[PDB]
Every structure is written in C-alpha cells, then in structure tokens.
Amino acid sequence: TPQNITDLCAEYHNTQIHTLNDKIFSYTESLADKREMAIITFKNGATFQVEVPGSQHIDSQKKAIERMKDTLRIAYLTEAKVEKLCVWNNKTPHAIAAISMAN
Amino acid sequence: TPQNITDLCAEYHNTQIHTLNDKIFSYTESLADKREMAIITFKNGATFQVEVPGSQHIDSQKKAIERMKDTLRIAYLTEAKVEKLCVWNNKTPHAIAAISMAN
Amino acid sequence: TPQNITDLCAEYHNTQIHTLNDKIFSYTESLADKREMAIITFKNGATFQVEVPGSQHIDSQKKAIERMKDTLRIAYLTEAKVEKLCVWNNKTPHAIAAISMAN
Amino acid sequence: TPQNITDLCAEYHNTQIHTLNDKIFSYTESLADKREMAIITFKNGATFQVEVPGSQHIDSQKKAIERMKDTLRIAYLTEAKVEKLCVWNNKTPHAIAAISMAN
Amino acid sequence: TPQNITDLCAEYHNTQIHTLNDKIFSYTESLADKREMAIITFKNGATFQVEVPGSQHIDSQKKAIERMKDTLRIAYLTEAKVEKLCVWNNKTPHAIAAISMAN
Ligand SMILES: [Cl-]
Structure with missing residues (x-):
C-alpha cells in the first residue's frame, strides 16, 4: 500500500502533485x-x-468526499500548513484527490 | 465550473453577492x-x-444545507472573518447559497 | 420568515424567552x-x-435535536456567551426550542 | 425529568456517582x-x-453511545474538567451512563 | 473487559504495541x-x-474506522501527544487497531 501522498498519486492517471x-x-x-x-x-x-x-x-467515495471538505474547512480555520496536494488535472479547477499536512 | 464565489453566484437566478x-x-x-x-x-x-x-x-442538497449550518456555527465561534456571501434575495431574510472566508 | 429569536419564539404556543x-x-x-x-x-x-x-x-426534528446537543456542547467548551433561549415552558427543566449567541 | 446527574443516576440499577x-x-x-x-x-x-x-x-442507544465517545475525546483534548460520572458498577471498567462538566 | 491498550492489543493476532x-x-x-x-x-x-x-x-467496524480517522485528524491539528498504538503488523504500512493518548 502507498506509504505517502506521492506514491499514492502516481497510482492514478491524470493526477499531479502540487507542493504548497x-x-x-x-x-x-x-x-x-x-x-x-x-x-x-x-x-x-x-x-x-x-x-x-x-x-x-x-x-465509499461519497463519504471520503464529505470527509475531505471537513478536513479543508478545519485546516483553513486553524491555519494548518498543507504540504502537498495530489490533484486530477483533467478538471478545472484541479480536483483534489489527496492532501498531506506537515506542521 | 466556477473558480470563485462571484462566478458561482452568477449561475443562479435572484442571487446576489454581499461583501461583509x-x-x-x-x-x-x-x-x-x-x-x-x-x-x-x-x-x-x-x-x-x-x-x-x-x-x-x-x-445531496439536504446534506450541503447541514454542512452549511455546521460551517456557520464554527465560523461564529472561531470569529472567522467572512468575506462574501452569495444569497437568494427573493427570500426574507436572504437565504445563503454560498460563503467565502479569507485568511 | 422570523429574523431573530424573540420573533421566532412568538410563533409557538406557550413558549418563553430567557435572556441569559x-x-x-x-x-x-x-x-x-x-x-x-x-x-x-x-x-x-x-x-x-x-x-x-x-x-x-x-x-428532521430528530436531526435538529442532535444538532442542538452538538451546539450546546461546543458552546460550553468554548465558553461562548448565550444571549437568549426560547423554551417550551410546559416541561421541566424547560425544553430548548432555539438559542441565540452574541457577544 | 431529573435536573442534575445525581438525581438521574438514582433512577437506574447498580449505578454509582464518582466525583472527579x-x-x-x-x-x-x-x-x-x-x-x-x-x-x-x-x-x-x-x-x-x-x-x-x-x-x-x-x-437511540447506539446514537447516544457515539455522542458520548465524541464528548470524551473533545473533553480530553480541551482539558475540560469532568465533575461527576454516573457509571453502572457491575462492569469492568465501569460503564459510563452520564457525565457532568462544570468549571 | 480489557482495561488499557496493552491488554486489548494482546487479544489479537498479528498486533503489536508501539510506544511513541x-x-x-x-x-x-x-x-x-x-x-x-x-x-x-x-x-x-x-x-x-x-x-x-x-x-x-x-x-459497526466501518463506523469505528471513520471515527479513528476523525481522531487522528484532530490529534494532528491539536498536536496531541500520542502514547501508544496497537497495530496489525501483517500489513504495510502497519494498520492502526487502537490508539492511546496521554498528556
Ligand atoms: Cl439500569
């Protein structure tokens, strides 16, 4: 199983990592x-x-989607540093597949 | 797909942007x-x-509504600055369609 | 539609407002x-x-009841000032119908 | 209805109040x-x-049980003082029936 | 029945405790x-x-999985000290079965 966001992202087509x-x-x-x-x-x-x-x-993907929105709302309110985003680049705005936060 | 609240708001009828x-x-x-x-x-x-x-x-609309109430409660308690609100002006009070928060 | 807690409380029978x-x-x-x-x-x-x-x-009455318990718990933990409570006085302790928070 | 944790606890069998x-x-x-x-x-x-x-x-039991677990987690993370706990003492560890929190 | 994470972890096969x-x-x-x-x-x-x-x-297992994800997310956001992890060592990365947090 992927150990990190980068290996996880490389498993799909039309995804790319963004390091913020x-x-x-x-x-x-x-x-x-x-x-x-x-x-x-x-x-x-x-x-x-x-x-x-x-x-x-x-x-199973509907629940992870609702989860992601909860994560983003709380990461925003607490000013948490998002490290990387794995996104689908065939969509505009790019669609979020995964997120990693590292203090 | 809208890239921001203003454009997303413009896709509906009787909506209106309020900058708070x-x-x-x-x-x-x-x-x-x-x-x-x-x-x-x-x-x-x-x-x-x-x-x-x-x-x-x-x-999907019933749960977005539940999420919105969760968002406003946590925004009120954390004293988060709300930037703009996209509202349906054909209601009283104006009903909220979308919300943006900035920094 | 009611625009504040006192006006909303008045649309119900034998309710009362408590200003805390x-x-x-x-x-x-x-x-x-x-x-x-x-x-x-x-x-x-x-x-x-x-x-x-x-x-x-x-x-929908069951969801609202659950939300209200979530709201009271977080208000308690964050020491949020509660302004008024609209209650059904035909119960004891008085049963909450609506709550307003403002500083 | 009971108006406090002590009165509520006394309505059940094999319960006990712990003051923490x-x-x-x-x-x-x-x-x-x-x-x-x-x-x-x-x-x-x-x-x-x-x-x-x-x-x-x-x-309703399954849902109240999930709420209690949310309450304990958030009380723990915020270091909220727990006042009393009503537990069924015929289980090990004693099983929680009710919790009161007061400053 | 089990009173702590160590006793509970020992009740399974392919588990092990990690003290962090x-x-x-x-x-x-x-x-x-x-x-x-x-x-x-x-x-x-x-x-x-x-x-x-x-x-x-x-x-019931799927609910506990969702709960765990919530716990890790706020623990991370709050920088809570995690004490021990009970994990399944037959998977890679090791899968979390239980977590204990002590300040
Ligand atoms: Cl009983």
Missing part, C-alpha cells in the same frame, strides 16, 4: 443545486476544488 | 417545527438564513 | 435508556434540557 | 472487532469505559 | 477510489495507516 507548504488562503463552500462543492486557494493564486458528487461516485 | 469582510455578530439556531434553521447577523445589521430543508431539496 | 447573556455553567450528557439527553445550567440556577428524541416526531 | 473534578488523564480508542470502544482514565487511577454497541442496543 | 509518546508529524488523507485512507507519520519516519474499508468490516 503554505496555509489555505481562502475557503469557499456552496450548497447551491448541482454546485455542492468547496474551493480553496492559496496566496500564490492556485485554486483547487473538492468535486461535486456525481454519478462517477460510489458510496 | 466581517465576523458574524450573532448566531441563532432553531429546532422548532418547520423552522429547523440557523440565522446569522453582522454588526452592520445584515441578517441571513440557511433555509429549512424541504420538499424541493434532494439528498 | 452568560456562558453555560455546566453541561450534563446522558446516554441512559429513555433519558438520552443533555442538561445545561447557568450560574443563576436556570436549568434547561433538549428533549429526548421521541418516535412520532419527524426525522 | 479533574481533567481526563488519558484517552484510548479502539476500532478492533468487537472492541469498538473508548476507555478513559484519571490521575487518581479511575478507569471508565463506553460500552461496545452490541446488536442488543435500541435505535 | 510524541505528536503526529504528518497527516495524509485520500479520497481516491480504492485508497480512501488516512496515513500518519511520526518524526523518526515511522508510518501507519487506517485501512480502507471493505465488507470484511461489518457495519
């Missing part, structure tokens, strides 16, 4: 129909999204 | 019949609500 | 059979409870 | 099969548990 | 298909995972 080593700059949350999502940006301008649960989402 | 750049002054939560909701106000007097989950709302 | 403007003094939680509830008191001796979830009332 | 007036010394959590539980200890050596949710527990 | 007495160094969360897991690291490099769910995990 910085806290989340802004956090956006929408409850709007068909746009139930979260968007975070960093000071340098990089924007990422936690993708809206569509048909392409099982039931 | 202020912490929530008050938080009111009700569990009373057919009024299971949260109401927030800012020092400027602005009052907003998170609509009661009802008939129109499907499941 | 103080933090919760103590928080009691019970998982014991038929008394799965939370009880809070203020330094002045006022004691309030969140009703135990009964079958006949709808599940 | 101290923060939880340690918190243990287990996800191992049939040992899904939380165990807490205090400086004075007292050890208490939250029972595993067997398929004997009513609907 | 230190805060989590890094936290990794993944929402990716088949890798919906959490990975933690300590300062000396030691890595542990909370295993991805499956039908092997009865429903």
Whole structure:
C-alpha cells in the first residue's frame, strides 16, 4: 500500500502533485443545486476544488468526499500548513484527490 | 465550473453577492417545527438564513444545507472573518447559497 | 420568515424567552435508556434540557435535536456567551426550542 | 425529568456517582472487532469505559453511545474538567451512563 | 473487559504495541477510489495507516474506522501527544487497531 501522498498519486492517471507548504488562503463552500462543492486557494493564486458528487461516485467515495471538505474547512480555520496536494488535472479547477499536512 | 464565489453566484437566478469582510455578530439556531434553521447577523445589521430543508431539496442538497449550518456555527465561534456571501434575495431574510472566508 | 429569536419564539404556543447573556455553567450528557439527553445550567440556577428524541416526531426534528446537543456542547467548551433561549415552558427543566449567541 | 446527574443516576440499577473534578488523564480508542470502544482514565487511577454497541442496543442507544465517545475525546483534548460520572458498577471498567462538566 | 491498550492489543493476532509518546508529524488523507485512507507519520519516519474499508468490516467496524480517522485528524491539528498504538503488523504500512493518548 502507498506509504505517502506521492506514491499514492502516481497510482492514478491524470493526477499531479502540487507542493504548497503554505496555509489555505481562502475557503469557499456552496450548497447551491448541482454546485455542492468547496474551493480553496492559496496566496500564490492556485485554486483547487473538492468535486461535486456525481454519478462517477460510489458510496465509499461519497463519504471520503464529505470527509475531505471537513478536513479543508478545519485546516483553513486553524491555519494548518498543507504540504502537498495530489490533484486530477483533467478538471478545472484541479480536483483534489489527496492532501498531506506537515506542521 | 466556477473558480470563485462571484462566478458561482452568477449561475443562479435572484442571487446576489454581499461583501461583509466581517465576523458574524450573532448566531441563532432553531429546532422548532418547520423552522429547523440557523440565522446569522453582522454588526452592520445584515441578517441571513440557511433555509429549512424541504420538499424541493434532494439528498445531496439536504446534506450541503447541514454542512452549511455546521460551517456557520464554527465560523461564529472561531470569529472567522467572512468575506462574501452569495444569497437568494427573493427570500426574507436572504437565504445563503454560498460563503467565502479569507485568511 | 422570523429574523431573530424573540420573533421566532412568538410563533409557538406557550413558549418563553430567557435572556441569559452568560456562558453555560455546566453541561450534563446522558446516554441512559429513555433519558438520552443533555442538561445545561447557568450560574443563576436556570436549568434547561433538549428533549429526548421521541418516535412520532419527524426525522428532521430528530436531526435538529442532535444538532442542538452538538451546539450546546461546543458552546460550553468554548465558553461562548448565550444571549437568549426560547423554551417550551410546559416541561421541566424547560425544553430548548432555539438559542441565540452574541457577544 | 431529573435536573442534575445525581438525581438521574438514582433512577437506574447498580449505578454509582464518582466525583472527579479533574481533567481526563488519558484517552484510548479502539476500532478492533468487537472492541469498538473508548476507555478513559484519571490521575487518581479511575478507569471508565463506553460500552461496545452490541446488536442488543435500541435505535437511540447506539446514537447516544457515539455522542458520548465524541464528548470524551473533545473533553480530553480541551482539558475540560469532568465533575461527576454516573457509571453502572457491575462492569469492568465501569460503564459510563452520564457525565457532568462544570468549571 | 480489557482495561488499557496493552491488554486489548494482546487479544489479537498479528498486533503489536508501539510506544511513541510524541505528536503526529504528518497527516495524509485520500479520497481516491480504492485508497480512501488516512496515513500518519511520526518524526523518526515511522508510518501507519487506517485501512480502507471493505465488507470484511461489518457495519459497526466501518463506523469505528471513520471515527479513528476523525481522531487522528484532530490529534494532528491539536498536536496531541500520542502514547501508544496497537497495530496489525501483517500489513504495510502497519494498520492502526487502537490508539492511546496521554498528556
Ligand atoms: Cl439500569
């Protein structure tokens, strides 16, 4: 099993690692129909999204998605340093697959 | 897919962006019949609500609504600065569609 | 729609508003059979409870009751000032209907 | 309804009130099969548990049990002083029925 | 029945206790298909995972898995000192079965 975010990311197609080593700059949350999502940006301008649960989402992935949004909201409020993001680059904003935080 | 709240807001009818750049002054939560909701106000007097989950709302929307109330409660308690709010202006108080927080 | 706790409290029968403007003094939680509830008191001796979830009332009522217990616990831990409580006075301790927090 | 932990505890069989007036010394959590539980200890050596949710527990019981585990974790991490604990003393460690927290 | 993490860990096969007495160094969360897991690291490099769910995990087991992920996330965010870890050593990285935290 992957021991870290980098090996984990290399296991999928259309994913790429982003090394930020910085806290989340802004956090956006929408409850709007068909746009139930979260968007975070960093000071340098990089924007990422936690993708809206569509048909392409099982039931085990639906829970991890809700988990990710909880993680991002609390990481933002506590000014936690996000180290890396593994994202799907075939989507705009890039969609978050994984996150790693290191104090 | 919107990259920010302003663009995401523009995709709906009767919406409106409010720039508060202020912490929530008050938080009111009700569990009373057919009024299971949260109401927030800012020092400027602005009052907003998170609509009661009802008939129109499907499941992904019912949980986004629950997440929004969680978000406002934790934002109120941590004194987080709310930047903008996308609201449906055809309701009173205006109902919240999305929220952005910055730094 | 009601825009504050006093107006919302008035739409119900035999309710009453309590102005505390103080933090919760103590928080009691019970998982014991038929008394799965939370009880809070203020330094002045006022004691309030969140009703135990009964079958006949709808599940949105059940979610709101659960949220209210989450809200009281975190308000207690963070020493948040509670402004007013709207309660059903036909119960003792008085059962909470709504709560407002403001500093 | 009971208005405090002492009165509530006296409504059950084989219960006992423990007065701690101290923060939880340690918190243990287990996800191992049939040992899904939380165990807490205090400086004075007292050890208490939250029972595993067997398929004997009513609907509301399983949910109150999950809440208690959330409460113990957050009380531990915030160093919240625990006032009294009502436990069923016919189990080892004694099983928690109710908890009161007061400053 | 078991009163601490050591006794509880000894009740399983392929488990072992790790004494760390230190805060989590890094936290990794993944929402990716088949890798919906959490990975933690300590300062000396030691890595542990909370295993991805499956039908092997009865429903009560899946709840405890979700709870553990929540616990590691706030423990990391709060820099809480983790004392011991009971892990399954037949997997790589070693899978977490129980955690104990003592300040
Ligand atoms: Cl009993």
